[PDB]
From a paper:
To understand the molecular basis underlying the superbinding characteristics of the Legionella SH2 domains, we determined the structures of L. longbeachae LeSH and the L. pneumophila RavO SH2 domain in complex with tyrosine-phosphorylated peptides by X-ray crystallography. Compared to the Src SH2 domain, LeSH is missing two β-strands (βA and βF) but contains a 45-residue insert between the strand βE and the helix αB. This extra sequence in LeSH contains a structural motif called the pancreatic polypeptide (PP)-fold, comprising an amphipathic α-helix (named herein as αEF) packed against a polyproline segment via favorable hydrophobic contacts. Indeed, the SH2 and PP folds together form a clamp-like structure that grasp the pTyr residue.
Therefore, LeSH may be considered a hybrid of two eukaryotic protein folds – SH2 and PP. Because the PP-fold occupies the same position as the EF loop in a eukaryotic SH2 domain, they may play a similar role in ligand binding. An overlay of the LeSH structures in apo and peptide-bound forms identified the PP-fold as the only region in LeSH that undergoes a significant conformational change upon peptide binding. Molecular simulation suggested that the motion of the PP-fold was distinct from that of the SH2 fold. Therefore, it is likely that the pTyr-clamp in LeSH may be able to adjust its conformation to a certain degree to accommodate different peptides. This mechanism of ligand binding may be employed by other Legionella SH2 domains of the LeSH subfamily.
Residue numbers in the entry: 10 to 167
The structure:
């Protein structure tokens, strides 16, 4: 009963950076070190945060509960930039429409599953989706008790 979930609660971008640095993420391969948190943008999803060697930036990938367990969420379009050409802006408009449609359905489904205590295993499906995205599970950063998610769904994600 005293075990701490492996899922972070709400954590800010500054602490995400500093936790990745504490575990030497910037001198390891991308995804060799990562953490799993309650998403601050979409409640009921999870966000996997890691360091991207190729672009020297922290990157995030969202998962959500689906009928078969945790799966990768719809991919958001590339965030706009001051340098964006008309061609990039036009693709953004299309990708964003498609993303918002797909994400709305995905979130609505995830929320309904997240609200129920289902007597079927789901933690293993999170582990499996992490493997599908090639996350070094030995490199999982574990929260302290005060850092960990308070969500009832994650009590046994230990
Ligand atoms: Cl997020």
């Amino acid at each position: 009963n005293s075990k701490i979930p492996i899922i972070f609660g709400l954590i800010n971008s500054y602490q995400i950076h500093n936790l990745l640095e504490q575990h030497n993420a910037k001198t390891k391969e991308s995804k060799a070190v990562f953490l799993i948190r309650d998403s601050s943008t979409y409640p009921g999803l999870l966000t996997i945060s890691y360091y991207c060697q190729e672009q020297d930036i922290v990157k995030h990938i969202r998962f959500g509960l689906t009928d078969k367990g945790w799966k990768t969420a719809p991919k958001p379009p590339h965030e706009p930039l001051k340098s964006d050409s008309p061609e990039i802006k036009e693709k953004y408009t299309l990708d964003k429409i498609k993303f918002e449609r797909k994400m709305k359905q995905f979130i609505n489904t995830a929320k309904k599953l997240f609200e129920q205590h289902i007597r079927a295993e789901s933690f293993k499906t999170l582990i499996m989706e992490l493997k599908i995205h090639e996350f070094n599970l030995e490199g999982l950063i574990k929260p302290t008790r005060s850092q960990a998610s308070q969500e009832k769904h994650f009590t046994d994600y230990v």
